[model samples]
Target: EFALGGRCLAFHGPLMYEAKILKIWDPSSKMYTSIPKPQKLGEDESIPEEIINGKCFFIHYQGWKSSWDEWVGYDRIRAYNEENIAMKKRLANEAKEAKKSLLEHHH
Candidate 1:
């Protein structure tokens, strides 16, 4: 609900990747987007326990292909703000030096 159509940061393993929140599979939402059920009371089970009950995000990363498009959980993403954006860049720089030290120190 917070990230869809908004900018955010998602964790791709040990690194940070900047991207947009494309779509989501939130079980709590029941707006009748696709089809209509005139007699169906506009509600059955908003939260489906048979299938995925939690919010599953359709995360499509920018600067990447749809082949890498992932349906991730809310726990995998973080709010993208100016503070986190700057930290993302810093993390990138730090990873390089950390990798260098990691290889050398272990060697």
Candidate 2:
């Protein structure tokens, strides 16, 4: 059961919306969330699909738009999240290593 006020990625047809879970419908297995408005990211005009309470698919957005395909699913989002986390960790580790090497050289 998804909790209210959690952020999620929602697909409304061809557009993906970065939304917040506003409500949950246990009877029908659905969730209501804030629908993201259409915004131009680059060349494509992002037209987020309609966000009706308890009717669309929801997944963790991880703070950014990772995919544009409306056909995206939970598994894909999970994979993206995992990959993103790994990348961040790797970058942090590299930075730390570089800093350590710099300190050693200075000493």
Candidate 3:
């Protein structure tokens, strides 16, 4: 549920992402975003994962290279969606404003 400033927080499930927090350094932040890594989506893609995505823990990027011995829980992963979450915030704001406006206008 915690966030790294403007960066959206993502999780595989439950509070697992926060629990197993390792590193949050974004290399691209220093250098400009480019190439097939971020440009593969053409430009319509605003979603973070849709643009650039990768696993944090399950990825054995060091020695295993691309192959692995198969790890469970690796397949089950979840990511945060700004678009979907913005809708929820909109609804909550509307409800709060509705209740306030109703009491004021009726009173």
Candidate 4:
């Protein structure tokens, strides 16, 4: 049907995975589309059914652009942790400098 082909659904992880992306339902546009493929895990043949329950960031909805039409991907904790460390260090340094400057003329 003309209403079902342009949609896309984002799974939690990767699939088929010939190092590629698969398609899913885009409830926003009544079409199907695919996002960038994720890195491969172990060589398992079982597709994760949890794919349906993961976070779903859609495109073409909520006042979005068609160029943004694609599935969403999950964030990795390791990457987040690394970023957190960098942010904390930068903030701490800034706070220390501010404190030293304030103490120069404070009781």
Candidate 5:
């Protein structure tokens, strides 16, 4: 099992951010590995227990998904998913148009 653990920004409350452990997952790897405990970020918030952390922490899959879904509305997630699907379709259409034009020019 690969030891993948690090501190990341996590949502605690409205406008409240805290340093928390990011979810670790590798589908191919065995699921028996231990999840690391979070390191405390002192009140000053100036010095982190560890330097590696970010403003937005992305939580996806397994337990992380349900936790995040409750914190950030599920409706918002669905909206973003739909937006991504639309963008994907739009890009594919653009590519197809370009290929069609190229084929026509070559004909």
Candidate 6:
């Protein structure tokens, strides 16, 4: 839903996280080097389903450690539109309340 290096929301379990689009299967003339390498050229092998569909990106969720960054399909992302922002806010609030309700006897 966003261009490369753009900001957006990506699903993390039941909630959405602020994320940035980082990378994708880069387009190149050398099929052997790219994610969707030509299967017809004796390179028959499994490809990422997201890359096969040509709509995945490497995203880094905000406030997360870099190692957790990983590829996600376009369907797992959403543009930072108004409604989507609202949804994120609601989810965030819900999680906060849940934690408060469950967390007990803290130091």
Pairs of colliding residues, candidate 1: none
Give the candidate number with the greatest TM-score.
1
- Higher-ranked by lDDT: 2 or 6: 6
Positional deviation of 49 in candidate 4, in angstroms?
30
- Cα RMSD for candidate 3? 14.8
Q: What lDDT tens digits, residue by residue, belong to model 5 across residues 1-107?
A: 11224332333342222222333322233121224343333364232223223222223333444444221221122222345556546666887898899999996
Rank the models by TM-score, top first: 1, 6, 2, 5, 3, 4
* Whole-model lDDT per candidate: 0.63, 0.41, 0.33, 0.36, 0.34, 0.69
Total colliding residue pairs, candidate 5? 0
RMSD of each: 6.4, 11.6, 14.8, 15.1, 15.0, 6.2
Off by over 4 Å in 6: 25-54, 95-107
Instruction: Please give, for residues 3-107, the per-residue lDDT of candidate 2 as tens digits.
Output: 445545444443344554533322143323334422122354222333322233334343556462232234222222445556546666887898899999996
- TM-score winner between 5 and 6, please give it: 6
For candidate 5, the lDDT comes to 0.34
Candidate 3: residue 88 lDDT (0-100): 44
Best candidate, lDDT: 6
TM-scores of the candidates in the order shown = 0.63, 0.30, 0.26, 0.25, 0.29, 0.62
Error of 4 at 19 (Å): 33
Residue-pair clashes per candidate, as listed?
0, 0, 0, 11, 0, 0
Candidate 6 per-residue lDDT, tens place, 1-107, comes to: 57767888989899898898765543342122222123222354333654545555677898999888876766677897999999989989998988887786354
The alpha-carbon root-mean-square deviation between model 2 and the true structure, to one decimal in Å, is 11.6
Residue 98 miss distance in model 1 (angstroms)? 1.4
Weakest lDDT window of 10 consecutive positions for candidate 5: 70-79
Could you tell me how far off, in angstroms, the CA of residue 52 lies in candidate 2 after the best superposition?
28
Model 3, 1-107: lDDT tens digits are 32222223233232222122222323244222331222222354222443334332222222333443121122333233566356446656787888899899995
Candidate 4 wrongly placed segments (more than 4 Å):
1-79
